[PDB]
Design a protein around this nucleic acid. Structure first.
Ligand SMILES: Nc1nc(-n2cc(C(=O)O)c(=O)c3cc(F)c(N4CC(O)C4)c(Cl)c32)c(F)cc1F
Ligand SMILES: Nc1nc(-n2cc(C(=O)O)c(=O)c3cc(F)c(N4CC(O)C4)c(Cl)c32)c(F)cc1F
Ligand SMILES: [Cl-]
Ligand SMILES: [Cl-]
Ligand SMILES: [K+]
Ligand SMILES: [K+]
Ligand SMILES: [K+]
Ligand SMILES: [K+]
Ligand SMILES: [K+]
Ligand SMILES: [K+]
Ligand SMILES: [K+]
Ligand SMILES: [K+]
Ligand SMILES: [Mg+2]
Ligand SMILES: [Mg+2]
Ligand SMILES: [Mg+2]
Ligand SMILES: [Mg+2]
Lengths: 723, 723
DNA sequence: TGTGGAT
DNA sequence: GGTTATCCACA
DNA sequence: GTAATAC
DNA sequence: AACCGTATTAC
């Protein structure tokens, strides 16, 4: 039992019986509770189903998921498939109406297309369509509720019953009671299915192969040609009852949805702040709840739950793991999260679960969020429109290069290594002064990656290649040294190992060399590392060739590796392969937007204030007259009107005056107000200049970047060699 | 298979090596990272370890946990045990410094006492002792590393720089980095151990048996005699270095701590609101965050995380399960939580995890929390003194009987069944009017339990026994009926089953009767239930004695069971076996406290306001003088002083006047103020009367209880017979 | 054997 | 997301 | 055969 | 709390 368990129908009836294939055991539960057991069976699917186009045939029939699905249908597969031996008249695929749901449908259809074709062409495979929306009228036991799949139906409901009704946007099947699920999706009389058909065998074949086959480039090409990254889509105005659709159209619509989503909004970083959406949300949410470096740590489970509740509609598993990674300093050059407890190690042993650990933002993460409160960055509504979230962070340092990013999307992947903050900033500052700067010059400031794990990087020519094209291959090699021993014996001591390499497996792989005697002369392998340093010790036998051994180990173990740059990121909504120049130029452009926006915000504040202060200065000279005036008025409105009519204060000033507390009349110091007036006028001038002159703005940009480097700069860790 | 895995020391050295036995794999991780691997081994323990006194040797060595612990020490067990074959000189037990930690230590010591005695008396078992406190990582720029085990040591640390920098209270090992853990508790040079010794074999034997043996009554007696339920404790001035302690004293100190905690603060309900701490926290936290019945549902994971982060220092597993239970209407007579999604069923299939579901408080749960904002109920500080939490809820209905409670503590257990709200309130109302009311009379209003699952309760005489003494045994029997069929055949149709019985297992157990043919004449068993009703059908064969079958099924399946009342609850911090009379009288006494407290609160508001209004009325008559006065003052303080000195306003009035907005000086309408003054005086009179006359107060109490009954009353579900 | 808050 | 253990009391 | 967000 | 599967890309 690696596969979900079948809950059968009460009877045997191939004419009528239906097999529901449900996304996840939990919804499988609800389905089992909500069904009509006389003729409806339930088989839950455990997450993502094997790609039957990519994988072998051997392996496909080692997949318990598949075998229990074959068995259950009771008609074998492929070669011998007999439709008259089927146990159900209908196979209904029921997933969340979200992207990952779309992906599962895709994966299943390419199973049935490739191994149970007669079933598909006989019109016996369907997609169940859960509702997207629920409208609720009153409260308590006077609730009242209806459902809607399109935006047009939803608009029709706003009349039907409105005048204070509210709306739930379903994010999955997991938010539905079994009776809700029956009424909308499982009841023959009221459900809405789509019947999958094959209109053209040729077009369907080609369509399945391009989207699901092991060849990446056709699929990428397809994505570039079909998905509009820049735009929105509009949902299929579903027809109540059955609706036919071609396998071709389904596969295209579904895979398109999924591709786009996991490109834009999962696996690939934004070119400006170098964050994936999950990471952005972790930081924003934590920041918003004041979980910052200067304040107490806060239980990880709390942070995670708020992230999941307010921003990120996905498993806690994913969120926590991401948050953990941001805290591991052997993975990030500048950690964005501090976390008390067991957050793993280089040995790759599992971190404590969120119930154990506690966490806060690091100091430098502060700087990613700097000036977010000042309308510096575009915000969007979250999934249930309760709350706005940033689409990108201000990013007062260029985090994409500094911490890098690895990911795997559809049609694209990324591997950007980390860099030294100070070097990166030196580069950015040069580029601010020299927009057309080329790679050779930039590489005087930014010579290459700087891994948190240190070690030796070799391959100047390929570093340059990578910085030009986004791709290159470099060599990363462990830092070693020899120690003499009693007996006329040596030992090799490793003190730094290559990025992304699991220490405990490295040590094991090395000891396999000894055990199998692949190279002569290894006495014993011992991991001697501790909380104060990395130290692997390879004790050699008496007079064995130290250099023969060390060379063998570099060659045939991960004591030395190749790192491959594949620098891909999201620029204007679309994925893009990019070198240093696009990266740095995008960052600069972004900081420009931030600073301008910041300065417009701060200037409006100072303006509004100065206008008040100008009025208060006047008031003082006529204080008694103003009191008499207010006293002689009828009410708040009347008083303001008289202040305007009689002394030409503005509405804004009049409001300020009239809302002053009585005790203010004691303090009547004009010069302190005049000093404030002065400093405001100065402040507005500085800010106006920035808005009004690109050079002034860019000089500020550079000033701030240097302040950051000054504060956070650290020595390089990885040494660079040329060959 | 099932037990934690040993991470060994680099070398073999029985003279020096140490085996750390660690509470949980996660802390096992930290320990493994923090240790000095040359001589320190690590074996994690997975939660609670088998009680080697209660369970009998055989099952004890089918316990993988124990076998891998025997194996690891390498000296066999029992009478074989050879100390010179041990692999370590020291066996160090390292748990959280919390109650469940204490419990683990207990369980382990009774293993080593009973099966490895020479090891204990050779002074080779130890307890690890992690710190309770830390003087802030958020204390400027850190450089603080300051830890403390007692309150006295903590007071000594308060004389460190930053004159008011902060304190972390460690709740477990999970909040410590591996280097923190080394420095405080694993490093020979700086750790503080307790060395376990046997000072008196006889006293130790007796002490272990009473606390750990299968006999409950000696243990209860021990608890009654030793645990001070109404007191605080005080820790040992621990000695830097080793400190010796007798097995006897350790077992007593540790088990005492655990017993007390799981009696008062885990498994047993409070007699007034009928809640366990976890349940109270769920409701308080959810209410505080406005997650109420009239507002939209909110992701379960979010709720849980906030509960865990602010109030309840225990696993999410426990919290969520408790929250789920509060939503299942076949477990609670009046559900306190509404939950969208798969929250289980009577078939006992597993609920969806908190990442799937969403939830809010039910309408009636509102009434448990009613007037919490009004200082009606004692609050305590939470574990990290950031926030106060209620020790009991106001409880505007008598939830203990209405929903009941089942639990298992140490020395005590509880089983209180649910009751019909209307009946319960009728009883309470009678008792308000008739304090000395006896059971016979009360049972005219409250005749017995009312299970949410319905069915038939038999045994009036035992119900009465239970209502007098707190114990009784009743019979709960499924609701059945016969249906005639075609071939001169009958079938038994069950429509309601007994409380706490899993339907799907019942159906299975019944079908096993058929399959094994234990009794003749069963044709087929069919669960025909659906989301609209429960319906099991037992089709009988032609001429089989349907009464012989039905009787066999009542006897030998859970189609009929015995329910045992064991009504135990917490009254003045101590556990107490109680009938209806203590229960109802405690509730009434509680509502009295609430209403008095409520009325004192509301009256203080009205008082403070009336005093303000009296002052404002005066001001108007002397408005010009008051302005001149303020104008002639120096500052806010000075103005108030002059208002007091010159016009005998109070501080409270003076503050109000001086903080008025200028536009208030328009108004000279005394009438509207006078009407408010009038209403306030009236309101205070009503409230004063309640505080000042028991009768008035109790009539209110009764009024409110009737309002509640009127609103929430539901027909009885369980029918009552006498057997 | 199995209830429900705990590890 | 299911599977697998223990504690505790009481029939 | 492995990285990291997802189911 | 560990153990167990999958998708997606590029060496
Ligand atoms: N039943 C279902 N489980 C999963 N699922 C979720 C995991 C997670 O949230 O981190 C996970 O780590 C995980 C590991 C597994 F090994 C795994 N396996 C299927 C078993 O046969 C092995 C599955 Cl399935 C896993 C799912 F995403 C959806 C499910 F319905
Ligand atoms: N490794 C550890 N696990 C647990 N633990 C925790 C559970 C929970 O928080 O809900 C749980 O449901 C659970 C079930 C188990 F079956 C179980 N088993 C021990 C295995 O051999 C089977 C264990 Cl251990 C369990 C622990 F509380 C502490 C741990 F270190
Ligand atoms: Cl087609
Ligand atoms: Cl002793
Ligand atoms: K068949
Ligand atoms: K850590
Ligand atoms: K190599
Ligand atoms: K003011
Ligand atoms: K539900
Ligand atoms: K029975
Ligand atoms: K005012
Ligand atoms: K007026
Ligand atoms: Mg989903
Ligand atoms: Mg996982
Ligand atoms: Mg603990
Ligand atoms: Mg569990």
């Amino acid at each position: 039992l690696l596969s979900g368990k079948l809950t059968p129908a009460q009877s045997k009836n191939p004419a009528k019986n239906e097999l529901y294939l449900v996304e996840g055991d939990s919804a499988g539960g609800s389905a089992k509770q909500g069904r009509d057991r006389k003729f409806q069976a339930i088989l839950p699917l455990r997450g993502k189903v094997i790609n039957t186009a990519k994988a072998k045939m051997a392996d496909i029939l080692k997949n318990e998921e598949i075998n229990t699905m074959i068995y259950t249908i009771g008609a074998g597969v492929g070669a011998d498939f007999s439709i008259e031996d089927a146990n159900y008249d209908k196979i209904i695929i029921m997933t969340d109406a979200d992207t990952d749901g779309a992906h599962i449908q895709t994966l299943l259809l390419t199973f049935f297309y490739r191994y149970m074709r007669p079933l598909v062409e006989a019109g016996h495979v369907y997609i169940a369509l859960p509702p997207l929306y629920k409208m609720s009228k009153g409260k308590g036991k006077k609730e009242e509720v209806a459902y809607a799949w399109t935006d047009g139906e939803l608009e029709e409901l706003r009349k039907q019953f409105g005048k204070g009704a509210t709306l739930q946007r379903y994010k999955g099947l997991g938010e539905m009671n079994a009776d809700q699920l029956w009424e909308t999706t499982m009841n023959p009389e009221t459900r809405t299915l789509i019947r999958v058909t094959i209109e053209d065998l040729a077009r369907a074949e080609r369509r399945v192969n391009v989207l699901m086959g092991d060849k990446v480039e056709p699929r990428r090409k397809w994505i570039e040609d079909n998905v509009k990254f820049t735009l929105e889509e509009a949902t299929v105005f579903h027809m109540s009852n059955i609706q036919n659709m071609s396998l071709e159209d389904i596969m295209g619509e579904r895979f398109g949805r999924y591709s786009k989503y996991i490109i834009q909004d999962r696996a690939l970083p934004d070119i400006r702040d170098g964050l994936k959406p999950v990471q952005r949300r972790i930081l924003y949410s934590m920041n918003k709840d004041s979980n910052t470096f200067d304040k107490s740590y806060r239980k990880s489970a709390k942070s995670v739950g708020n992230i999941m509740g307010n921003f990120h509609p996905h498993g806690d598993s994913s969120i926590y793991d991401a948050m953990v990674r941001m805290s591991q300093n052997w993975k990030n050059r500048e950690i964005l999260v501090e976390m008390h407890g067991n957050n793993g190690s280089m040995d790759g042993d599992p971190p404590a679960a969120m119930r154990y650990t506690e966490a806060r933002l690091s100091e430098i993460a502060g700087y990613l969020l700097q000036d977010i409160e000042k309308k510096t960055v575009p915000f969007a509504w979250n999934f249930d429109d309760t709350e706005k979230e940033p689409t990108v962070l201000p990013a007062a340092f260029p985090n994409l290069l500094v911490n890098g990013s690895t990911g795997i999307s559809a049609g694209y992947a990324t591997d950007i290594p980390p860099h030294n903050l100070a070097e990166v900033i030196d580069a950015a500052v040069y580029m601010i002064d020299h927009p057309t700067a080329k790679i050779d010059k930039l590489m005087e400031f930014l010579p290459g990656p700087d891994f948190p794990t240190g070690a030796i990087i070799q391959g100047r020519d390929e570093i340059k290649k990578a910085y030009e094209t986004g791709k290159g291959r470099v060599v990363v090699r462990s830092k070693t040294e020899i120690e003499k021993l009693k007996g006329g014996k040596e030992q090799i001591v490793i003190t730094e190992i290559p990025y992304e390499i699991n220490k405990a497996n490295l040590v094991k792989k090395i000891d396999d060399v000894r055990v199998n005697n692949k190279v002569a002369g290894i006495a014993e392998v011992r991991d001697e590392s501790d909380r104060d340093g990395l130290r692997i010790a390879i004790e050699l036998k008496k007079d064995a060739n130290t250099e023969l051994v060390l060379n063998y180990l570099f060659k045939y173990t991960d004591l030395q590796i190749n790192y491959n740059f594949n620098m891909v990121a999201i620029d204007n909504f679309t994925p893009r392969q990019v070198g240093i120049v696009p990266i740095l130029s995008s960052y600069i452009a972004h900081r420009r937007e931030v600073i301008l926006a910041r300065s417009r915000f701060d200037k409006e504040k100072a303006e509004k204030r100065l206008h008040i202060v100008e009025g208060l200065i006047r008031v003082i000279s006529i204080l008694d007259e103003v009191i008499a005036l207010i006293r002689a008025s009828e009410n708040k409105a009347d008083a303001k009107e008289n202040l305007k009519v009689s002394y030409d204060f503005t509405e804004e000033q009049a409001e300020a005056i009239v809302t002053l507390q009585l005790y203010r009349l004691t303090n009547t110091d004009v010069v302190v107000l005049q000093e404030e007036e002065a400093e405001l006028r100065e402040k507005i001038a500085m800010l106006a200049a920035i808005i009004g002159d690109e050079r002034t703005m860019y000089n500020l940009m550079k000033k701030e970047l240097r302040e950051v480097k000054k504060k956070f700069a650290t020595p390089r860790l990885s040494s660079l060699e040329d060959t």
